Amino acid sequence: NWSVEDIVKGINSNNLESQLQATQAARKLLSREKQPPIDNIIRAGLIPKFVSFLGKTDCSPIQFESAWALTNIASGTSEQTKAVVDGGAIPAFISLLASPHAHISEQAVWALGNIAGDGSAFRDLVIKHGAIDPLLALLAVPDLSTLACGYLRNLTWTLSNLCRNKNPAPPLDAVEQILPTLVRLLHHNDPEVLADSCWAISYLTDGPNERIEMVVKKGVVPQLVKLLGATELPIVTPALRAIGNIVTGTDEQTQKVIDAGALAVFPSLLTNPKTNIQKEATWTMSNITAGRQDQIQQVVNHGLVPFLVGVLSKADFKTQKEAAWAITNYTSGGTVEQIVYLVHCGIIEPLMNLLSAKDTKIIQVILDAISNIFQAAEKLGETEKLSIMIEECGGLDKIEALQRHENESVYKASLNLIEKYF
C-alpha cells in the first residue's frame, strides 16, 4: 500500500494518469480490513478531489476508483459520512447512476446506500437530490432475473436504506414511489434480495397505522407469511418483524395476517432455537391476543395456547415477559370460555412462578392477568376453586409477600387480591 503522503502527491499532480494511479492506491488503502486510515484521508483534503473525479466521463477508471474510495469513507461514522456529503458527493453519485458502465452505476448505488443509511437527514437529502427516479429506472425491466445477482442485491439494499429510520419516517410520496418496485423484489427468488426486501417492508410498517396501511394495501401479507416459513434465518427474521409490526395496527390489519395463514407457522416460531425469533414471535402473539374475541379464538383454534404456556414456563426472560403480556391481553379481552380454556391448559403455575422475577413491570402485568382471571371466575361462581389452585402451586405465598413490595401498584393490587379472594 502507498502512504497517504504519496497519494496526496499523486492526486495533486494535475496529471490524470498519475491521479488515477493514486486514486486506485487510495481505494486499496481504504479497502484493507484492519483500521483503514479514513480520518487521515479526510484530513489530507482528498474528498473534494475524489468528488471531482466522479465527473470525468472520459476516464471511467478514475470514476470507478474514486466512487469506491468514497463508498468506503461513507461506510464509516456519521462524521466521516458527513465529510463525503460536504464534498458535494450526492449529486455527483446520482449523475453516475446513468453510467453506461454497470460496475460504475453499481458503485454509485452502493455509495448512496451508505449515505442514506447514515440517518433520516441524509436519507431525506438523497431523496431531495432526486435519487429515487434513476434508482428505480435501473430496475425497470420486465423480469428481474435478467439482472446480475450482485447488482440487484446492491440496489435492493440501497432501496431498503431509503425506507429506514424514523423521526421522521421517509416522505410519504417517496414511500409510494418505491413500494411497487419493493413488492417485485419481495417476490424475487434470491435469498439476499428477499432478506433486504423484508427489512425494507419491516421499516415501512414500523410506525403509525397509516404507514402500515400503505403496505398492507399493496397485498404483500401473503408473501410475508410465505417468507415467515423460509428455512433461511436471515429471511425469517425481517419477515417476522414485518408481520409483528403489522399486527400492532388496527383489528382489520391484524386480520389480514390471520387470513393469510400466519398462525400456522407459530408452533415452530414459538419453539425456535434462536432466542430473538422466540421473543419476537411471542411479542407478535401478544399483539394478536390484544385483538378481537374472534382473533383470540383463532389463536385457540391453531393450538397456540399450549405454546404460550410453554414459553411462559421456560424461555429467555425477555421472551417470558412477552408471554406475560400475551396472557394479560388474552385475559383482558377474552370471553369467559376462552379464559376457562387458558386455565385448563395450565397457565396458573407458570404465571405464579414468574412472580419471583426481580422486574417490577412483569409483576404488574402478571397481577393484572390474575385479576382478569378472577373476574372470569366470579361470573362462574368458581373463585374458590381458583384460589385453591393458586395456593396449591405456591402462588399465595408470593402474592402475600408482594404486599410488602416497594412499588405502589404491586402491593396495591397484591393486597386487593388477598382481601377479596384469600
Partner: peptide, 13 residues
C-alpha cells in the same frame, strides 16, 4: 388490551 409497538452501512472489500 394494549397493542405494543416496537448493518446500515457496507464497506466494499
Amino acid at each position: 388490551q394494549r397493542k405494543r409497538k416496537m448493518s446500515w452501512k457496507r464497506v466494499k472489500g
